[PDB]
Amino acid sequence: TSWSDRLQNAADMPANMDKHALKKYRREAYHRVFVNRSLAMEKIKCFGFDMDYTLAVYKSPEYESLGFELTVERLVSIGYPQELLSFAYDSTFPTRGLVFDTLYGNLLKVDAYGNLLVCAHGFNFIRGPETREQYPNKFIQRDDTERFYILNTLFNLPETYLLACLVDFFTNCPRYTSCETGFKDGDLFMSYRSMFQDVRDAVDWVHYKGSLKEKTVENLEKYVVKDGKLPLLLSRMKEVGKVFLATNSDYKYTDKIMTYLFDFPHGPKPGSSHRPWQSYFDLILVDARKPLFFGEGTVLRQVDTKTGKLKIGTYTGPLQHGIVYSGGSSDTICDLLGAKGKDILYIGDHIFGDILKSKKRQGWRTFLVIPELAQELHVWTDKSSLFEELQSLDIFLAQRRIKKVTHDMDMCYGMMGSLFRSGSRQTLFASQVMRYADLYAASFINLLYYPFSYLFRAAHVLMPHES
Amino acid sequence: TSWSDRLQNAADMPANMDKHALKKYRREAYHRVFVNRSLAMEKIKCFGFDMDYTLAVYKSPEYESLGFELTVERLVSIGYPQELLSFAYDSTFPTRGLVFDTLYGNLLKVDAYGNLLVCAHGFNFIRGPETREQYPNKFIQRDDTERFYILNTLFNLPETYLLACLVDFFTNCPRYTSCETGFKDGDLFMSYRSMFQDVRDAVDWVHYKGSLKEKTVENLEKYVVKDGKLPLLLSRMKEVGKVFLATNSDYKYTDKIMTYLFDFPHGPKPGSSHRPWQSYFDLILVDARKPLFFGEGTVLRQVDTKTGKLKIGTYTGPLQHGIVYSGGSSDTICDLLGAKGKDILYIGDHIFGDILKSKKRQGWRTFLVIPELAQELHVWTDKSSLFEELQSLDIFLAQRRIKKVTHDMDMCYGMMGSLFRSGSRQTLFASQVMRYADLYAASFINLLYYPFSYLFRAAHVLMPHES
Numbered sequence A, B: 001t002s003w004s005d006r007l008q009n010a011a012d013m014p015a016n017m018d019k020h021a022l023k024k025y026r027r028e029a030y031h032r033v034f035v036n037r038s039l040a041m042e043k044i045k046c047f048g049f050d051m052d053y054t055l056a057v058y059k060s061p062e063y064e065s066l067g068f069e070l071t072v073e074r075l076v077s078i079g080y081p082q083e084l085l086s087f088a089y090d091s092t093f094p095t096r097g098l099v100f101d102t103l104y105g106n107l108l109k110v111d112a113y114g115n116l117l118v119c120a121h122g123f124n125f126i127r128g129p130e131t132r133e134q135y136p137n138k139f140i141q142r143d144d145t146e147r148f149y150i151l152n153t154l155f156n157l158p159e160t161y162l163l164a165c166l167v168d169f170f171t172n173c174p175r176y177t178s179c180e181t182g183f184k185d186g187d188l189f190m191s192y193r194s195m196f197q198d199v200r201d202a203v204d205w206v207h208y209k210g211s212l213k214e215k216t217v218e219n220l221e222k223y224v225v226k227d228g229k230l231p232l233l234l235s236r237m238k239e240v241g242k243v244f245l246a247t248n249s250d251y252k253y254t255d256k257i258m259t260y261l262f263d264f265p266h267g268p269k270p271g272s273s274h275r276p277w278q279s280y281f282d283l284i285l286v287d288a289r290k291p292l293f294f295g296e297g298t299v300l301r302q303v304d305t306k307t308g309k310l311k312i313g314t315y316t317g318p319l320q321h322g323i324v325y326s327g328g329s330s331d332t333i334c335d336l337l338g339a340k341g342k343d344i345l346y347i348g349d350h351i352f353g354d355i356l357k358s359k360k361r362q363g364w365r366t367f368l369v370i371p372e373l374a375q376e377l378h379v380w381t382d383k384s385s386l387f388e389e390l391q392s393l394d395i396f397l398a399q400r401r402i403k404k405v406t407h408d409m410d411m412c413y414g415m416m417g418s419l420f421r422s423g424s425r426q427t428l429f430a431s432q433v434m435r436y437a438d439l440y441a442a443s444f445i446n447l448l449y450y451p452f453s454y455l456f457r458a459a460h461v462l463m464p465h466e467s
């Protein structure tokens, strides 16, 4: 099964708010909130939510497969070869947080320090010695954003795989000659960089100018996890604080998704009257443009909720009941809900644009949703054997077996391994989760299972000379 | 006593290279190398050294007091008031790694996340509630380099204290009216920012156009720690690898300092012939301009070692015996010593310009010298009681006593507390040591006490969900 299967299984369950049931439930990994830094919930005055891959978790592999399919069609449409059409999305290939090197056309799994853990060129996994040809120090300068692109979001799962399909196809298609930095077809040269830009633009185009959204919304059961405990959680938050939505997506789409998310015969709990999704929020903001939202932002606009268009002009009014904002900045939230950054818990899946940025620019408290965790956890438990074997093989040498066992652990997760590590080496992703997510979970719903008085605790950190 | 007292005490001792003596010596905190990330020394092919506050550790408080005294004289010289002349350097005030806020004229001790641990305005320590006036979220955006300056080096110890003297003097001098962002004297307005720039320029001027260097070199016993084990360590490194000097300072100064550093009746060991400092290095480079050195660098020049001037032109030749370089880049070192970044251990005291930058830009291995550690360690041991009391007071509540005990621990270190923490809260400095220094010690000489085969080990890191 998939991580969205695990999530949706848990979603289909009623909430048993009996306090002993709660305590028991959240000691189970699947339902636990994990803590990187201590957070006293009683201090949180505003709970803020992201929408895509946070409140609205898209079913896998269905959604990735749709995105891939329409990206490929867009590319064939602009003149890429018909062979593309025979590609089919494969969920066992891509892991999130990979770096596409646009110079050399490789996918890299790196650690926090730019060190190379895995290198695939198409579907060929390049081993240690061979990577030194292009990476003399087995290292990339990942801030070199012109050359290196980090495929940080679940939205990038289909393109991670498509990049590899395309490198593989051109490499092995006799019409094209492979060169260091791209492919020659007679008098046309396609660099990996230009190829990469096309894929990137086509993904954007599918989400913005194409048919992805329309196809999602016309079959919401197929594409979006739904959970009757969402209204319960939000109603409970609203009892102790303020709740807000801040989404990069536009009004029309947010309304269709959010309406689905709340589409039950009842309100917070079974038996209670249904109420519109907007009622659960003290402030609703779309077209956020995160991460820029956490700095200068853009001009504050007001949505005409009847037409779905923006009113003409900058909005200069106060928080009214029923107003929906567009644009603005993180200061809009603070000022209008009368909060300081440390009074806000923002909940989101984008490690960069939701968590890193809110934490560094603004000192918000952060909760990261990691939808893959719901399944990464089952693997970590079931194959704790291998990791233990590896753990123990590092102490006995304190070599070829370290390498063989690493590969066997990593393969259980997929061709590109755990989101969090390659053997004993932690990924950039893992290290940024630890660095900037105060709390993290497989789902935001795991907060339901903790009283609002709860103190999420982490042990104090000590330097080597201090221990 | 001072940290340089501790260092010089250890320096005055001969090396007992008996292997059992070695093992014993380095288990003592003062002589230990501390490990943030595992490092196999057998992999290191080049050992690179910084000079100022690394090889050449300046005696405290003598050196800071000299710098302060000449900075103050420079300022009076350009028209600051004669009262400045009655200031005298006080070593118990400043801690390294403070942030001067140029808007409000405060010194801040912050954590990795910009959270405020201490705020002093002149010598007035502003408590929790009062800091919310200027810092509504008790937080600064430390990347806002136009507003916030981090006083990261031992060279900045005198200016940290001078900033506070000056804020205190203008505040309490009846000629000046204190405003939010600076001081009014009739028709002249002095912002904290313009004041700060003057101090900063005057420090630069003292080091570059003034008399600090001349006064150092005319009394090297007073101002610079010297240790007969330096040549031993370097000779031993040269047996297993290549040794290089890369200093921001110029040739003439480097030669006077380095000659002092090696001024013993003997060479590597007692009884052996003395040899010139340059003989210990496979590559010597001055005017490095770190951190830019770790990127594009500057043009490679060759020093005329007879005149102390640079030859005219870019140097296009190979590594020759006896050549001294100026400028260039980190690639100069790699290319000319035929090394890759992970074959280099660079040793230095500048957390930013030596360690952070070499690690992020180039993947060098890093050893940070923390000269204050030689004394920070004695306090941590002797007052382990207080920290233990605090440690234990955090678990019993798992408040006013947490706060009172924090202050008593921090005061043992100075008015601005440990370099590494304020109570249980770790400083930005501490967190960057952990993040970018693979190894660290109170002195580079602590490497002497470890065989070159040694494996510096750190335990593998696990995420909360993995433990």
Ligand SMILES: [Mg+2]
Binding pocket: A050, A051, A052, A053, A054, A348, A349, A350
């Ligand atoms: Mg999202």
Ligand SMILES: [Mg+2]
Binding pocket: B050, B051, B052, B053, B054, B348, B349, B350
């Ligand atoms: Mg230095």
